[PDB]
Structure formats: structure tokens, C-alpha cells
Amino acid sequence: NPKAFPLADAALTQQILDVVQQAANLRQLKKGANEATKTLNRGISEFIIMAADCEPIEILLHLPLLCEDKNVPYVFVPSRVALGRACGVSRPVIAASITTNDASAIKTQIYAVKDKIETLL
């Protein structure tokens, strides 16, 4: 067991990154570590994606404890660069969060990814 433990393999990683890109287009993604912990303590979050290769790792390992407290799925993508590119911004991000919405046109996709990463976790 490493610190960044529940890492996803390549198929789950690309499923995660595709729904991250679609939520970023639909304004349902809060990107960055402290925005992610803000939306996590506010409770509007469906799952959090941490990238398992940033330059420290505890910098985002603070978030699994918060997700565990509030029972939110969390998953580790192995590329901060690809995560930022999926988020649609011109920088690497290390953590992102899918906020809850019921007037959301990708709710089935988000729920399927939640089920996959929760059976992983």
C-alpha cells in the first residue's frame, strides 16, 4: 500500500477523464485542491479525483481523510498533466471535484463512474 493507494488503471482513467472533461464543459467541475476541499466540506461533491504524481503527495493526501469523513468516493489518476488537460485549463491540476447537480445532462455517466470507482474503493 502506497499513500496514493486507490489508483485507477488505464481504462478507468480514461473513463474518469472523459467525464471530467464533460463536467468541465457543463460547469459541474470545481478544479484545484483548495476549491476541492471547499466543495467537499460544503457537501456539494459527487467524487474527487486526485493525481498521484504531483511534486509532494501529502499536498493532496489531505483530501482522502475529508472524503472518508463525509463518505465521498475518491480516486487517483496517474497524470496531473492529463488531468489538467481534461479539466480544460492551461495548467496541470492535482485535484478536482464533480459537484452535485440534478439539472445535469451527464448524471448517468457520473453515476456510472461513481459506481466503478466505489467498487474499486
Partner 1 sequence: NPADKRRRLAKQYLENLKSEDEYNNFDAGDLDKDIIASRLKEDVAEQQGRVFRYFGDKLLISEAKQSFTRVGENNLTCISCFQPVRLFAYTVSKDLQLTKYDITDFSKRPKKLKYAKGGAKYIPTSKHEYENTTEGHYDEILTVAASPDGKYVVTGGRDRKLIVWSTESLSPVKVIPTKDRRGEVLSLAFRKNSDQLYASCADFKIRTYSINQFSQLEILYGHHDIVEDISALAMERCVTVGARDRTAMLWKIPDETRLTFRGGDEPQKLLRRWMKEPLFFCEGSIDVVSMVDDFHFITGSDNGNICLWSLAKKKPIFTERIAHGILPEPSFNDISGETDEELRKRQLQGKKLLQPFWITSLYAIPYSNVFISGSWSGSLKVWKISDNLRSFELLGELSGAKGVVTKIQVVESGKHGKEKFRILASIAKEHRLGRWIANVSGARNGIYSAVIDQ
Partner 2 sequence: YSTPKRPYESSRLDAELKLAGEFGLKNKKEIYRISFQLSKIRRAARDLLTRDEKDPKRLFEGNALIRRLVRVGVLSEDKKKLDYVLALKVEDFLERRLQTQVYKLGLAKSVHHARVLITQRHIAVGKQIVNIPSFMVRLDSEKHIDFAPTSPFGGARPGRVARRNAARKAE
* 104 belongs to the binding site for partner 2 (CB under 8 A): yes
State which of positions 40-69 bind partner 2 (CB under 8 A): none
**Of 73, 33, 69, nearest in space to 51 by CA:** 33
Residue 37 binding result from partner 1, partner 2, none, given CB thresholds of 5 to 8 Å by partner type: none
* 103 belongs to the binding site for partner 2 (CB under 8 A): yes
- The owner of cell 471530467 is 20
* 33 belongs to the binding site for partner 1 (CB under 8 A): no
**Cβ closer to partner 1: 66 or 82?**
82
Residue 3 binding result from partner 2, partner 1, none, given CB thresholds of 5 to 8 Å by partner type: partner 1
Q: Count residues contacting partner 2 (CB under 8 A)?
A: 8
* 108 belongs to the binding site for partner 2 (CB under 8 A): yes
Please answer whether residues 33 and 59 qualify as being in contact, where contact means their C-beta atoms are separated by less than 8 angstroms.
Answer: yes
Q: Where are the beta strands (DSSP E) in the chain?
A: 29-31, 47-51, 74-77, 95-98
**Cβ closer to partner 1: 64 or 84?**
84
Among 59, 89, 112, 121, binds partner 2 (CB under 8 A): 112
Instruction: Indicate the residue type of 25.
Output: N
Please answer whether residues 73 and 67 qualify as being in contact, where contact means their C-beta atoms are separated by less than 8 angstroms.
Answer: yes
CA distances from residue 112 to 47, 80, 97, 116 in whole angstroms, order as listed:
11, 23, 16, 6
